[PDB]
Amino acid sequence: NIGLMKAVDKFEYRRGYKFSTYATWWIRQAITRSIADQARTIRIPVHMIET
DNA sequence: CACAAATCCATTGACAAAAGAAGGCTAAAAGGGCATATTCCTTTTGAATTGTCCATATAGA
């Protein structure tokens, strides 16, 4: 939801794409940045979890 | 019992190692930005309290 608020603060309908198509990127980005940042007890940075 | 010499404690001085810093670097860590469409999760025993009827006492009709 926090990512969703991020998206709604930046949804652009002039381009004319349906909302869900645009909000999905932000919601997946938020959930994944979350899981990387706060799922380990000994946190490891984002780039390292991507590796 | 005084005078002559070897043996101690102190500064000069320089010299090398060592550490505190500083800059220059580079690995790394953290942001930010993504636009065909995504729409509601997977064993008993006992005591004490709480919510449920029962006795009953009283107040109107």
Resolution (A): 3.4
Is A38's CB less than 7 Å from nucleic acid strand B? no
Rounded Cα gap, residues A5 and A41, in angstroms: 28
Q: Find the Å distance, CA of residue A10 to C1' of nucleotide B42.
A: 35
Sequence-distant (6+) residues with CB within 8 A of A13 are A19
Tell me how far apart the alpha carbons of residues A51 and A37 are, in angstroms, rounded to a whole number.
14
Q: How far is the CA of A43 from the C1' of B46 (A)?
A: 48
| Cα distance between residue A46 and residue A35, in whole Å | 9
Dump the DSSP string for A1-51. -HHHHHHHTT---TT---HHHHHHHHHHHHHHHHHHHSSSSS---HHHHH-
Tokens 């000994």 belong to residue: A42
Rounded CA separation A24/A27 (Å): 5
Proximity of residue A7 CB to strand B below 7 A: no
Q: What is the DSSP letter of A5?
A: H
Answer for A42: CB within 7 Å of strand B: no
